[PDB]
Amino acid sequence: KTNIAVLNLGTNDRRNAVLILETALHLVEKYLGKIINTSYLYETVPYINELMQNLEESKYEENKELIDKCEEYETFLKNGKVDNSILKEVNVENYLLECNNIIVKNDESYFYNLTVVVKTFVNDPLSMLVVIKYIEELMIDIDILFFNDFTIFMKNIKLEKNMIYKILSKYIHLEIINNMVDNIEFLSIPHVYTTHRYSILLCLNDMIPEYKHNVLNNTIRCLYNKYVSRMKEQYNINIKENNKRIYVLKDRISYLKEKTNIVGILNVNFVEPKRAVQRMFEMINEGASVIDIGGEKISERDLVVPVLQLFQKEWNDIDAKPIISIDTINYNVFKECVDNDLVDILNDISACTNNPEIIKLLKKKNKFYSVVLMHKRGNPHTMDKLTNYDNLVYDIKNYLEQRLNFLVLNGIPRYRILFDIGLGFAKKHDQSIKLLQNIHVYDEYPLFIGYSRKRFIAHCMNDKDQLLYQKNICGGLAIASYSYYKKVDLIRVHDVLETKSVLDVLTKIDQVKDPNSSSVDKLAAALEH
Amino acid sequence: ELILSEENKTNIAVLNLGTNDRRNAVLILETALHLVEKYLGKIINTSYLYETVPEYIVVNYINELMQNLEESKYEENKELIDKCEEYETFLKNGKVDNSILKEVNVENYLLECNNIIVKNDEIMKNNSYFYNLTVVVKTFVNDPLSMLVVIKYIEELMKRRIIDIDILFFNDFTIFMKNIKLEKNMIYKILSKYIHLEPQEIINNMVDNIEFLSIPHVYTTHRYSILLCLNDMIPEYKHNVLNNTIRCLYNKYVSRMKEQYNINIKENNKRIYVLKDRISYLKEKTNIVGILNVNYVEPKRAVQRMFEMINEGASVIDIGGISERDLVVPVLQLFQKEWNDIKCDAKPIISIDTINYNVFKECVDNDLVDILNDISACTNNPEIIKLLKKKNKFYSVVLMHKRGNPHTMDKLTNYDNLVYDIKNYLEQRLNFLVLNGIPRYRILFDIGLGFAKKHDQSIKLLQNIHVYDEYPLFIGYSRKRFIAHCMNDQLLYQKNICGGLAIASYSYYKKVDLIRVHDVLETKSVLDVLTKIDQVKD
Ligand SMILES: COc1ncnc(NS(=O)(=O)c2ccc(NCC3=Nc4c(nc(N)[nH]c4=O)NC3)cc2)c1OC
Ligand SMILES: COc1ncnc(NS(=O)(=O)c2ccc(NCC3=Nc4c(nc(N)[nH]c4=O)NC3)cc2)c1OC
Ligand SMILES: Nc1ncnc2c1ncn2[C@@H]1O[C@H](COP(=O)(O)OP(=O)(O)OP(=O)(O)O)[C@@H](O)[C@H]1O
Ligand SMILES: Nc1ncnc2c1ncn2[C@@H]1O[C@H](COP(=O)(O)OP(=O)(O)OP(=O)(O)O)[C@@H](O)[C@H]1O
Ligand SMILES: Nc1nc2c(c(=O)[nH]1)N=C(CO)CN2
Numbered sequence A: 001k002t003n004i005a006v007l008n009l010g011t012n013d014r015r016n017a018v019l020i021l022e023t024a025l026h027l028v029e030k031y032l033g034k035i036i037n038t039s040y041l042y043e044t045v046p047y048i049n050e051l052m053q054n055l056e057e058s059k060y061e062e063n064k065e066l067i068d069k070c071e072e073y074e075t076f077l078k079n080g081k082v083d084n085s086i087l088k089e090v091n092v093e094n095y096l097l098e099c100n101n102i103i104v105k106n107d108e109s110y111f112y113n114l115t116v117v118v119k120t121f122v123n124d125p126l127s128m129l130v131v132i133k134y135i136e137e138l139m140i141d142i143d144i145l146f147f148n149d150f151t152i153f154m155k156n157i158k159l160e161k162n163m164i165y166k167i168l169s170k171y172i173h174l175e176i177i178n179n180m181v182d183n184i185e186f187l188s189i190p191h192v193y194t195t196h197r198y199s200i201l202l203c204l205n206d207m208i209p210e211y212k213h214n215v216l217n218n219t220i221r222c223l224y225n226k227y228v229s230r231m232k233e234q235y236n237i238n239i240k241e242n243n244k245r246i247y248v249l250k251d252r253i254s255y256l257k258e259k260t261n262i263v264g265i266l267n268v269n270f271v272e273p274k275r276a277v278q279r280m281f282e283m284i285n286e287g288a289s290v291i292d293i294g295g296e297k298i299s300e301r302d303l304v305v306p307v308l309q310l311f312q313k314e315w316n317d318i319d320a321k322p323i324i325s326i327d328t329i330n331y332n333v334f335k336e337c338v339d340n341d342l343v344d345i346l347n348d349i350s351a352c353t354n355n356p357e358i359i360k361l362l363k364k365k366n367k368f369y370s371v372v373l374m375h376k377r378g379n380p381h382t383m384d385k386l387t388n389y390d391n392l393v394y395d396i397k398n399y400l401e402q403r404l405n406f407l408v409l410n411g412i413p414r415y416r417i418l419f420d421i422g423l424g425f426a427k428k429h430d431q432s433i434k435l436l437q438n439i440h441v442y443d444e445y446p447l448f449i450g451y452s453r454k455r456f457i458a459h460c461m462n463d464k465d466q467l468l469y470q471k472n473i474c475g476g477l478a479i480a481s482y483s484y485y486k487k488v489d490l491i492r493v494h495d496v497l498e499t500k501s502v503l504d505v506l507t508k509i510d511q512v513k514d515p516n517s518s519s520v521d522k523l524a525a526a527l528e529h
Numbered sequence B: 001e002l003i004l005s006e007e008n009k010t011n012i013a014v015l016n017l018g019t020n021d022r023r024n025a026v027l028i029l030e031t032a033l034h035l036v037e038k039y040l041g042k043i044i045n046t047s048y049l050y051e052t053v054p055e056y057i058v059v060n061y062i063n064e065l066m067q068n069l070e071e072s073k074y075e076e077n078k079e080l081i082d083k084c085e086e087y088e089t090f091l092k093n094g095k096v097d098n099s100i101l102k103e104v105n106v107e108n109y110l111l112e113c114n115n116i117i118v119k120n121d122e123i124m125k126n127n128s129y130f131y132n133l134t135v136v137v138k139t140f141v142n143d144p145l146s147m148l149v150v151i152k153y154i155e156e157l158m159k160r161r162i163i164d165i166d167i168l169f170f171n172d173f174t175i176f177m178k179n180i181k182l183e184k185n186m187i188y189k190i191l192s193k194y195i196h197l198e199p200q201e202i203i204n205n206m207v208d209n210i211e212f213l214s215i216p217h218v219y220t221t222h223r224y225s226i227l228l229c230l231n232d233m234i235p236e237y238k239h240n241v242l243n244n245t246i247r248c249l250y251n252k253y254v255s256r257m258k259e260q261y262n263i264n265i266k267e268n269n270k271r272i273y274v275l276k277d278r279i280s281y282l283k284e285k286t287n288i289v290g291i292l293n294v295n296y297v298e299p300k301r302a303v304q305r306m307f308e309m310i311n312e313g314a315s316v317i318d319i320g321g322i323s324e325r326d327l328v329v330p331v332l333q334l335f336q337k338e339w340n341d342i343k344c345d346a347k348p349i350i351s352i353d354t355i356n357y358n359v360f361k362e363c364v365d366n367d368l369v370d371i372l373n374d375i376s377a378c379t380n381n382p383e384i385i386k387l388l389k390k391k392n393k394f395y396s397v398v399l400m401h402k403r404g405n406p407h408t409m410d411k412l413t414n415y416d417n418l419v420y421d422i423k424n425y426l427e428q429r430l431n432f433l434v435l436n437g438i439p440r441y442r443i444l445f446d447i448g449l450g451f452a453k454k455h456d457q458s459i460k461l462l463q464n465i466h467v468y469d470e471y472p473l474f475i476g477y478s479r480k481r482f483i484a485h486c487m488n489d490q491l492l493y494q495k496n497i498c499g500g501l502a503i504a505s506y507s508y509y510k511k512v513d514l515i516r517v518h519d520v521l522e523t524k525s526v527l528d529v530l531t532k533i534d535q536v537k538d
């Protein structure tokens, strides 16, 4: 069989929430099936290196290779046209009354939530839960929110010292042997916490908005939107304030919308690798947190791979390391860099439509890599003419969204996908402005944009060659300011120092010590006479 | 006719001025202000200028006129004053002399007022923006009816709907007189009391025109544009015939139309300030003011720089200073000559950054400047305030906050409530200029970044710039040291300029009226792009 398995992942260690939660994912890819959906990483309010190069192999092979549909997943969503459970089913009232009891028994730091959908070979929840629990020990808490359309309840189980073997044998080519049983007292599906823990309902809204379990009184979106709605008028809380969406560039947490990172452009396009590493160094000094390297006679690979090499050396010569992204659509170039640890991010200006296979290089059995998906049409010679859009803003958004869905169906972690509207690519000047005017449409999403030096900036101003050069750099800093206030996550610029300076001042003006001083100081003045 | 009473009394009167001529509003209204100053008494308060939505339902002969006015029989006194007792009495509104004209009571007043409204609404019901301004006059005219006569003369002089001047209040009087007819000779007699008459057919027109008299003016309570103006001047004031203070009335009016009508009465009733001779809508544009520091020998280089800065996009040049006079006047005199060699309203507004009466006197006499930028807020030599007023010319002024002088002011850094202390100071400086006849809408506020302010304090003043949302705001941050203190070998130079451009952006979003800058082209490029981003094509 193949079932649809919705897990919920967890951790506490901020410094390593990545390292941990990502490993939980490799295992889930290995031992239960294929990850076909993840959600955003979230921060919520209520040695391990070596381990990898030796672990028991799964009783199945992995399909690294791509897919565009999943019928089982699709059944699941609708749902319920699946073979009957291999375990005792339970009614509406049966479940409603039993759920309550489990809650009050348990009635008597930061949390990091990350749902997942799994195409699973495993036969049933219980069997799943065993495969899971074993997983936990090998290393963090991994629930099951759903298993097909099952309304399951089972109240007591003890299991063997060999049974554990025999289930964990059916799936895995194998002191912790018994360690599991005092914990596996229970199995509720849907999980009990499901309607109650907000972090959960928040991870689900990413993945399965339109879902509806029968033992649930509305859809996961209409459930989510009621939690948020009510927790505002009832308690007067804004619940998103303390539950913050995360995205990851290398290995660290980044809170969506809380910074505008500078991405320094290094464009190698007779030319001299020694300089290009000096320029990288400069850039780091000047404020850049990312360097975007690209070439695009002799080859892309020759222009880019050495320079990244010289760099990777000279950095060991001398951990505030610049994040490195490569501006490439070339599968092979990216394969090298990634096999050689030369880069952290793929900047793919074709949103990985040049060579969808490139997505495969974004995983290893231990490491994930983040990607910039950019929208364009055609190439630099034709794109100027490729300017008709039905609904400019939304067409580009939907394009990027579909594009993300694809990587995510192929187990590229959502939180590692960045969107880029691609300013100046198959856009008239007024269309580049309209996109900026409307950038709020990306408020839910990690956003990366590149306005720097582009022709449209010039157009908005209406020796004489060098005046326009200067005005163009100057005009850019307006867009940096705009970007700062619209809270764009990354901006791709040639002029780091000027950009950093501007972002520095803007940051200060905004750094308030006391958020009520404004109204307090006003009231004091009005009582002074 | 105890109307010609020998007795020299001092009254308080509140006037309303309106015109429909957008392109000439300043000149129309400022012409009226001059004639009010000339014929009625002392202007001791004014509101902002407003562009207002008509509330009917509830060009160059002026320059000749000003050359040919009859003399007032009352002296002009330009001396500065700090206080006006009659005005404080008016506001309170305690004991004043009795009304020469006969009063009605409230019940009676409201009946006759109310009457006139319905009647009037009807007339208009069966059937272009206003430019409004109110004024407080300390007046030597004996009574409202007498004042109205003189007002009507002024309205005639100003013709060949150009100007409407109404009496809103006069002391604490409640008056409603229904069928005035006034002898042609009585008009002459009243006019002659107050004016050396040297213009006869005019007195014929006036007899028709004065038919009743209502104090308060009938519309006072009914017309937004009128309450808008009053709220500026006398928010605390309460006439006996009014349910509440001007501010309560004003606030209620704004509330009512939000509920009963869902209107937002503010959107199309715009506050105006005035830099030279044209209308600026408050908060509608961030103007660049280019800095010219003559700190030299050679003026020709300075005038080229001036011309550069215009091309670079500055709409105001702020010039500052071997005499300060010797540094500055040549440059402005050269510039004026080099500009006249030349395209007529591409000329920058010129401000002179000076606290020195003698220097500003000479500039103004030789039509060299438009604006005084007085960094002491005219506290150094308030006599300079006399120089802001001519016979047919008002000059605008920037009032900036600081303490001490450049050697002292780095240790005068202690404030109880930085943001409001400074705001209160500027508000008091404005009250002083306004009490002394400077139009409220010609005065610009400047918090004085970097003067008797630690860096943190400069930032703090910028974080809370919102406090000046109701007022014309001028700031100068350019290249000051606080900017550098805010970020992590001309590096310092560049990073400093770069940081300025951040503050240009902030200024843009906070809708600061004027930013005073060294780097014009860079600043202009930034504001051009920000403007375009805001410009929705639909
Ligand atoms: C006739 O020739 C021309 N035809 C069209 N446009 C031209 N100029 S352009 O200024 O509008 C302009 C400049 C540079 C670009 N691309 C630079 C990049 N931009 C991005 C990137 N990656 C990501 N993720 N996002 C990016 O915006 N990589 C490279 C695009 C448009 C142009 O002149 C050079
Ligand atoms: C040890 O020396 C020093 N100590 C403290 N601060 C110094 N410099 S500073 O950066 O803070 C600075 C720079 C220039 C100024 N003044 C220039 C002006 N500023 C304005 C104006 N007019 C109007 N209306 N508004 C204005 O802000 N005119 C001139 C004030 C402070 C400083 O260096 C000379
Ligand atoms: N849907 C479910 N998925 C997993 N375990 C479940 C489920 N329903 C009931 N259980 C039981 O509840 C236990 C929960 O312990 P676990 O350490 O896995 O953390 P948890 O589910 O986050 O809850 P808690 O930390 O409060 O115990 C499981 O060991 C199992 O016996
Ligand atoms: N307090 C007052 N101030 C001015 N005019 C007054 C006052 N009380 C009564 N009036 C009378 O109202 C007349 C209105 O004439 P005016 O030329 O100002 O017309 P208007 O402004 O179009 O009038 P209204 O405001 O009544 O619609 C005056 O000529 C005068 O006779
Ligand atoms: N806003 C506004 N509306 C009016 C005004 C005026 O001055 N301002 N004057 C009127 C009659 O003269 C009629 N309506």
Ligand SMILES: [Ca+2]
Pocket (backbone or CB within 6 Å): B036, B037, B038, B041, B042, B043, B075, B076, B077
């Ligand atoms: Ca006078």
Ligand SMILES: [Mg+2]
Pocket (backbone or CB within 6 Å): A141, A142, A143, A144
């Ligand atoms: Mg669990």
Ligand SMILES: [Mg+2]
Pocket (backbone or CB within 6 Å): B155, B163, B164, B165
């Ligand atoms: Mg009139």
Ligand SMILES: [Mg+2]
Pocket (backbone or CB within 6 Å): B164, B165, B166
């Ligand atoms: Mg009138």
